Amino acid sequence: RTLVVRRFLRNRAAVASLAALLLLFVSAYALPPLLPYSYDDLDFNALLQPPGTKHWLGTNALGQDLLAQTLRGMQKSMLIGVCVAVISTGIAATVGAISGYFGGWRDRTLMWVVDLLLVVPSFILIAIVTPRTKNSANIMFLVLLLAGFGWMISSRMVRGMTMSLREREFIRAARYMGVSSRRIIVGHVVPNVASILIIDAALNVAAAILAETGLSFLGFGIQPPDVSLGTLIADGTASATAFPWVFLFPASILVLILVCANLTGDGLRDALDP
């Protein structure tokens, strides 16, 4: 273990980005109960005011505080990102593993089915199902829908990983000394592939947030009175040209979240890959 954390902790940018990402995630939940105004509380005396002594980040056209709104947007949009990345990596792991294990016709049917699923861009397929996930309170169905169409390219990397390792030599030596197959699995493959499945999760977080916020921007994702960073940017853009903060603050927060996720991904990959 010690060597990988030593490699990562020397990567100052990556450790800094991971720190910032965790502090954002914690703040999105820990901070709101301390603020003077919540989301869904409207001050009709202070419509479209700039930042000041009572509205830390000003208000939007409805009189909503913009700080509280963005904390709520971060909540929803970062929770969906994490959950989608985890589930997507899980599906990718299982499909890739079974294909790269069996080889032969079963692999050539599972990789051809993945190739078929990639035929029409994923965003289109997600947006076709979205009328059914719209207008329900539980985010579960949106998370399931985003994960079910995100695992496909990761399946290919996992297929490689497995196919290469299935013919590595330490794996060979094992069979020649009486180790049972379950002992091979809990003993060798899990310790050796887990480190790269974690890279899959780290890289999928950014794509998951991108997908959710784009879908929300078009009006297909999260529905008012709930909010997402995509919802906030879509609401603010029609005002940005006259009053800029209502678009620049949510947008800068979203771009910062994505930059931190990508820095963490690349740095962690460079920490594992020699």
Binding site: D115, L116, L118, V119, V120, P121, S122, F123, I124, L125, A127, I128, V129, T130, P131, R132, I153, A206, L210, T213, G214, F217, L218, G219, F220, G230, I233, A234, T237, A240, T241, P244, F247, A251, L254, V255, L258, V259, N262, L263, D266
Partner: protein
Amino acid sequence: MTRYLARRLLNYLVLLALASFLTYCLTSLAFSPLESLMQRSPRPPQAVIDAKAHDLGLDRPILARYANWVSHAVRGDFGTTITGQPVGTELGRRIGVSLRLLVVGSVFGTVAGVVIGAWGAIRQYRLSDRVMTTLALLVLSTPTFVVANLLILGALRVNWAVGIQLFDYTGETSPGVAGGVWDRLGDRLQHLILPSLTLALAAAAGFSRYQRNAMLDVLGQDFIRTARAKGLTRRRALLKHGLRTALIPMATLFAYGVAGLVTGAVFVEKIFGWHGMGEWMVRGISTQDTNIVAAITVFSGAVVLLAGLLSDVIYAALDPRVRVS
């Protein structure tokens, strides 16, 4: 060459012929178009419900419904919208508007990205590499709908500062060109700058990272050292021997690059107000329209698969290990 290409053409035909089927089933399960009718207040008399169900085919089971749809689509009749307009009248113009955006975006984008990535890999860890890799990270981290609006705000401020409308960004063409053809083309170019730049940045930021990885892998091979040992200069070796070899991996990724640009064009067409296929997708999903969306998934699959066959031709032409054995 013309064995590998033939065998992979048959594969793409089968992929499209099943993509259309499965996304028509997905569309026909996800959408319930008669909901508006069935929720009208003086509840529509059944005759209307049955009549409109028939006119849209909702009275047939999925398999027969799709058989009928293809039976007409292969004849060029893509059916009617939920409001009763034919789909075929829009489709040609929409495809034109969309392809003119995608082509310029992808051509300029991938060429720029390849050059930037090769330069970074050649000058690894020098200042120019540091700057270009972080800029690529930024451009890859901003969502398309943020980039488009940032550029629009920027143009607005330019116009105000310079004192004249320097950039135009609404629609594809202005009302009138006052005769002449040279201008009839010029105005369209002016309109096309910002929409296509929005896509070119995304493409360049992706392909620079991919090309940097591929070129760094090529610099790990011995044949660069062999080439220089013959008397070539460092830069002629890098270009003629390294960069041509590094280009081969890029030919395989272009299909997925185009799949990304097809997604970006939805946002670009909406934000800049271009009447193409991407805007039609949003309209069709919003109104629960099966036929609009069926036409659009066939287009979006076909454009991605033709990217694949062009990439297949280029990968055979570049690499001899598929030409001869």
